[PDB]
Amino acid sequence: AYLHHMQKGKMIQPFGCLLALDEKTCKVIAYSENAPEMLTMVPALGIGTDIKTLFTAPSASALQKALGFAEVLLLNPVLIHCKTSGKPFYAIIHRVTGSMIIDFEPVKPYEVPMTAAGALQSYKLAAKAITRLQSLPSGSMERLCDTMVQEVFELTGYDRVMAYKFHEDDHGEVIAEITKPGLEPYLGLHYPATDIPQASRFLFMKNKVRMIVDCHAKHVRVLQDEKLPFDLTLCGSTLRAPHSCHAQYMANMDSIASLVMAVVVNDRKRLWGLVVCHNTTPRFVPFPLRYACEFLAQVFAIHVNKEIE
Amino acid sequence: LHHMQKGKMIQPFGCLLALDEKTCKVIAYSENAPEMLTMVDHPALGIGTDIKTLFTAPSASALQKALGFLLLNPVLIHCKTSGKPFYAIIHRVTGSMIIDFEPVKPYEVPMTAAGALQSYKLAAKAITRLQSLPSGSMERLCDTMVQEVFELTGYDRVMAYKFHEDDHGEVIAEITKPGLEPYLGLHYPATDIPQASRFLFMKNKVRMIVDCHAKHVRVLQDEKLPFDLTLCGSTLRAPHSCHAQYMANMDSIASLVMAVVVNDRKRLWGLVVCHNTTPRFVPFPLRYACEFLAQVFAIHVNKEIE
Ligand SMILES: *[C@H](C)[C@H]1/C(=C/c2[nH]c(/C=C3N=C(/C=C4\NC(=O)C(CC)=C4C)C(C)=C\3CCC(=O)O)c(CCC(=O)O)c2C)NC(=O)[C@@H]1C
Numbered sequence: 336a337y338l339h340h341m342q343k344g345k346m347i348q349p350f351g352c353l354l355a356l357d358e359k360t361c362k363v364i365a366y367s368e369n370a371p372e373m374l375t376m377v378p379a380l381g382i383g384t385d386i387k388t389l390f391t392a393p394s395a396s397a398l399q400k401a402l403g404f405a406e407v408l409l410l411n412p413v414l415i416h417c418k419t420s421g422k423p424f425y426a427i428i429h430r431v432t433g434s435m436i437i438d439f440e441p442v443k444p445y446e447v448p449m450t451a452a453g454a455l456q457s458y459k460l461a462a463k464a465i466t467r468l469q470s471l472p473s474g475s476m477e478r479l480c481d482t483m484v485q486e487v488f489e490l491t492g493y494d495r496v497m498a499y500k501f502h503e504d505d506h507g508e509v510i511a512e513i514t515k516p517g518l519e520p521y522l523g524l525h526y527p528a529t530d531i532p533q534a535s536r537f538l539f540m541k542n543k544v545r546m547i548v549d550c551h552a553k554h555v556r557v558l559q560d561e562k563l564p565f566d567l568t569l570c571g572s573t574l575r576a577p578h579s580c581h582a583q584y585m586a587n588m589d590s591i592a593s594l595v596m597a598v599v600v601n602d603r604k605r606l607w608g609l610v611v612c613h614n615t616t617p618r619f620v621p622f623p624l625r626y627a628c629e630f631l632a633q634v635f636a637i638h639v640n641k642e643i644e
Numbered sequence: 645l646h647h648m649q650k651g652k653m654i655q656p657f658g659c660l661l662a663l664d665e666k667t668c669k670v671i672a673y674s675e676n677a678p679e680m681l682t683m684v685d686h687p688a689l690g691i692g693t694d695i696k697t698l699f700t701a702p703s704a705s706a707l708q709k710a711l712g713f714l715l716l717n718p719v720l721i722h723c724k725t726s727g728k729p730f731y732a733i734i735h736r737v738t739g740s741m742i743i744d745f746e747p748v749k750p751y752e753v754p755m756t757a758a759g760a761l762q763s764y765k766l767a768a769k770a771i772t773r774l775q776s777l778p779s780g781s782m783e784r785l786c787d788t789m790v791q792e793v794f795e796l797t798g799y800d801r802v803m804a805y806k807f808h809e810d811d812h813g814e815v816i817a818e819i820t821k822p823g824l825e826p827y828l829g830l831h832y833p834a835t836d837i838p839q840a841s842r843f844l845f846m847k848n849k850v851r852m853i854v855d856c857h858a859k860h861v862r863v864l865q866d867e868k869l870p871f872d873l874t875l876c877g878s879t880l881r882a883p884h885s886c887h888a889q890y891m892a893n894m895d896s897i898a899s900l901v902m903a904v905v906v907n908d909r910k911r912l913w914g915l916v917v918c919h920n921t922t923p924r925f926v927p928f929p930l931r932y933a934c935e936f937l938a939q940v941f942a943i944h945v946n947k948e949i950e
């Protein structure tokens with residue numbers, strides 16, 4: 336049941352908007368319902384729209400040029416400007432067979448001159464983290480995980496950061512934790528397997544970093560071309576809305592916002608666990624920082640697998 | 645020392661402005677800056693020009709904020725009429741804020757963040773390969789460093805150049821494109837690298853020369869400025885004429901040099917030296933990534949001695 340509704344991914348979070356394009360025609364074959372408002376000035380946006388009508392000439396050309404690379408050759412994000420408004424967005428591209436799917440995340444105008452500076456700064460901080468993991472003496476899973484949650488806490492600014500390990504019966508245990516002062520600790524607690532369905536663990540193998548900005552936000556529908564006789568697969572989107580059971584789960588534990596990083600060993604390939612960030616209030620972090628976190632989690636996974644041996 | 649610090653020439657691949665640390669107005673500029681930044685009241689660019697007349701408002705605001713600091717480089721700026729974009733690289737000296745401007749292709753502006761992330765990722769992967777090395781073999785450590793830099797930077801030749809106790813140098817590792825003659829193993833006199841150059845490398849850890857044959861450009865300053873403006877910290881500083889000549893005879897038209905400073909007790913261990921047969925330019929984000937790679941390399945060198 337869970338996998339169907341997560342794979343189709345027809346509901347997104349409202350912090351961004353989504354377009355899907357036909358690789359052959361470059362025209363819009365699906366869009367989220369908030370996309371006309373975000374990207375135009377309400378020359379419309381609908382099924383069949385050409386993207387050269389929406390963005391400035393260098394922007395349209397950069398996206399058009401992405402159509403011609405293999406996915407492993409995609410460099411994200413792309414900085415685009417809207418043609419009428421001048422509004423800037425980060426465009427995050429991925430491919431599913433003959434479709435190109437694009438997530439658009441807003442950028443503040445005063446942030447634009449700092450886009451390269453901020454990207455370098457995020458990766459530099461992550462790189463300094465990697466050196467401290469590596470400097471650590473071997474022999475203690477506990478010290479390794481403490482160092483990791485401490486580094487992530489400083490890098491990401493969330494109220495709570497946990498290392499969550501899966502046991503062989505698939506139930507989980509919180510084995511390391513750092514929080515801001517007032518909060519209730521979860522260190523040492525065990526949780527049922529069913530708190531994280533099989534389908535979610537499966538998706539984490541491919542989508543290694545997941546952000547939920549606000550569990551109470553009103554989700555937005557994706558509309559697709561009525562001519563299509565199948566559903567598009569949108570689960571690779573950075574914007575996919577959380578299933579309502581989990582959004583209800585979040586509100587109950589006063590984690591209004593979250594950032595989760597998969598820890599995949601032998602990347603025998605196995606989901607060892609998760610690094611779980613919670614925030615009491617809504618929180619957004621831009622793509623370059625999440626991208627750096629993905630690499631930090633990869634290196635962490637190498638050290639985890641070393642200690643096992 | 646006094647025609648590297650008080651020498652007033654830059655390489656022509658970019659241009660330079662210096663601004664007064666209080667008024668924010670132009671107190672020095674390279675002779676190529678008017679055509680590069682305005683396309684040639686008053687001559688649009690001279691002593692006393694206000695940066696609000698040169699750049700779009702978001703661009704000028706971002707530079708005003710930097711004068712208020714802490715520095716994250718580079719800043720992406722657009723010129724006011726042309727919309728012509730540059731990377732602005734900022735540093736401070738006692739009297740002034742100095743800005744090096746390196747051009748960006750207008751149609752590449754959408755990919756600036758993407759390219760910066762990719763540069764740092766490749767350097768971060770190189771860092772993990774150095775770390776995973778079994779300790780004990782200085783040869784293996786240095787061979788790995790030159791291989792990674794070669795792949796990252798795309799230069800024709802990459803060598804590790806070690807300083808001996810008498811300050812003479814030795815090439816102890818090297819990788820080149822096929823068919824180039826090796827220099828591995830050669831010893832060179834201490835005088836090839838004067839002490840003044842060594843002292844600069846302590847502060848400016850990455851130095852790029854795009855084309856030893858390029859015609860250098862003068863920096864003009866107000867003659868009543870109560871101090872002498874130094875260019876030691878500019879990414880654009882011209883090579884000394886002895887070295888421009890030294891490079892031509894050895895068919896290194898372009899170079900990229902990384903200092904290797906241990907106990908960063910502080911001493912210059914050596915250099916990672918990249919050479920190219922033809923002119924070569926690499927953008928600031930890649931040089932910035934190389935700086936961190938060089939610091940991490942220095943730590944492993946220091947470990948090997950001990
Ligand atoms: C509804 C009947 C059942 C249900 C479904 C469900 N859960 C998830 C996803 C996650 N569940 C967790 C669990 C935890 N988070 C924590 O912080 C802790 C320790 C305090 C636990 C145990 C996590 C981390 C996830 C991943 C969330 C993410 O991707 O950010 C899903 C998938 C949701 C989606 O839309 O991707 C579903 C469907 N949960 C229940 O408890 C019910 C039994």
Ligand SMILES: *[C@H](C)[C@H]1/C(=C/c2[nH]c(/C=C3N=C(/C=C4\NC(=O)C(CC)=C4C)C(C)=C\3CCC(=O)O)c(CCC(=O)O)c2C)NC(=O)[C@@H]1C
Binds near residue numbers: 832837838882886901
């Ligand atoms: C002129 C009278 C003397 C002189 C001066 C001089 N040298 C440098 C700087 C450098 N010299 C070297 C030397 C080498 N490069 C190599 O590739 C090799 C081995 C194959 C050697 C021995 C290097 C690497 C530098 C640094 C250059 C840089 O910053 O990119 C300077 C500094 C130039 C400047 O303006 O910074 C000067 C003045 N060289 C001679 O040979 C004379 C004896």
